[PDB]
Amino acid sequence: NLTLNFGPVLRLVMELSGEMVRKCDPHIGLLHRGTEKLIEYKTYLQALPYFDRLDYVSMMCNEQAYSLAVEKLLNIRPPPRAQWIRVLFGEITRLLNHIMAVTTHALDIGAMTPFFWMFEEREKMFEFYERVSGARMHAAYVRPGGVHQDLPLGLMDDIYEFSKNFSLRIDELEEMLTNNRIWRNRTVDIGIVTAEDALNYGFSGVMLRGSGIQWDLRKTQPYDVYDQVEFDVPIGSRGDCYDRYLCRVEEMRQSIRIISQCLNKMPPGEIKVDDAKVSPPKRAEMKTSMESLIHHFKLYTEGYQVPPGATYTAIEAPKGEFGVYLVSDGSSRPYRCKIKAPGFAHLAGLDKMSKGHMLADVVAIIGTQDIVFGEVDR
């Protein structure tokens, strides 16, 4: 059979018997940087910015997974207002990821116009990131204990004005794709996954929900205040690219439904745990009180010690189930930090999902899995 090393951050080694794909062999590592080994020379706070850079489309949801894991080993609890902020920006991050996933999935198969309409919406959401943290993408805003700073005055009004119009933007996206017969032909009955193969291959997220499996960690193993909001979990019927495209488009609508509740049920209070052996004190009280200066000095040089133990903590990240197997030895620096990227198992099933399909279908199947190689390789 003819063999092609398509290469370049993905190198695909495929053997093709004419038009059919007889085997797909993904060669990865072109973006391996040794993240997990570097985290072992950092304090728990110094390793926080690494997680913004794993799945760089869903930055603030990787912080939350790491923050949930550390807060679990510390045995502390973030304050209620911080949790509501961490859900508000978890759903805003979920709009950022699904626009990128859907529109770059459609741009790789020809439809270039929806990319430009929706990247004007991403630009506006990048201002919400920049107004709270000061950075458009790698905010490092979610931390063990809560969030770094409180929302600036007037941001929630600007989130409301944006959310008020977004549902119309999705509708225009669906006027170009959902019923277009060319789009359906590229995505219907392509990459069919059985509900039993998906579980045994390690799939999670819309890779499960597209095949009819009723599973969403936000509802079954909730974290923060996801059990105080109302939303629906889209479910597929045929387990193909088209059903999975409808699940992400419908999850963008259920995020607007969650955001509308976070804006109305946002409580008052503080935004980081009121324990100054974990979260740094205020600068005003760091410059007047002796204990607050001692604790500021030690938290930013040694860091807080985490009791010995190991934990596996996971969230429903935009691309699936994202978790970390964090191991502590009782010091300020983690011993081992394994990262479970949902796209690592999804891309390992590309060979299975591309059996009996054309070469041009492998493009669609890679798109439907929503692969970002920052997390796959780490």
Binding site: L153, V273, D275, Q305
Partner: protein, 95 residues
């Protein structure tokens, strides 16, 4: 927002929707770039009495794992009760 009436009619008809009510460009409905100073609150631990740290020390209440078995009539059990079935949404069951 400066589109003439005719072009507004043409754009609305082409898309089938009322675009002027949900413009994707921001004009004046946005917050002022200068805002009054805030006064943020303080947490529950900002007290002058009845506030000893040994009564709210989360890290010191963590314990090492408990050993249930170690090599150095009973009714069957499962890790947890079986998960309850999900219910169709009355909001919009079918898309």
């Amino acid at each position: 927002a400066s589109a003439t009436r005719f072009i507004q009619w043409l754009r609305n008809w082409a898309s089938g929707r009322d675009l002027q009510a949900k413009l994707q460009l921001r004009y004046q409905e946005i917050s002022k770039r200068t805002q009054p100073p805030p006064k943020l609150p303080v947490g529950p631990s900002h007290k002058l009495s009845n506030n000893y740290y040994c009564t709210r020390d989360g890290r010191r209440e963590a314990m090492p794992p408990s050993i249930v078995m170690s090599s150095q009539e009973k009714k069957a059990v499962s890790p947890a009760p079986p998960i309850k079935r999900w219910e169709l949404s009355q909001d919009e069951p079918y898309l």
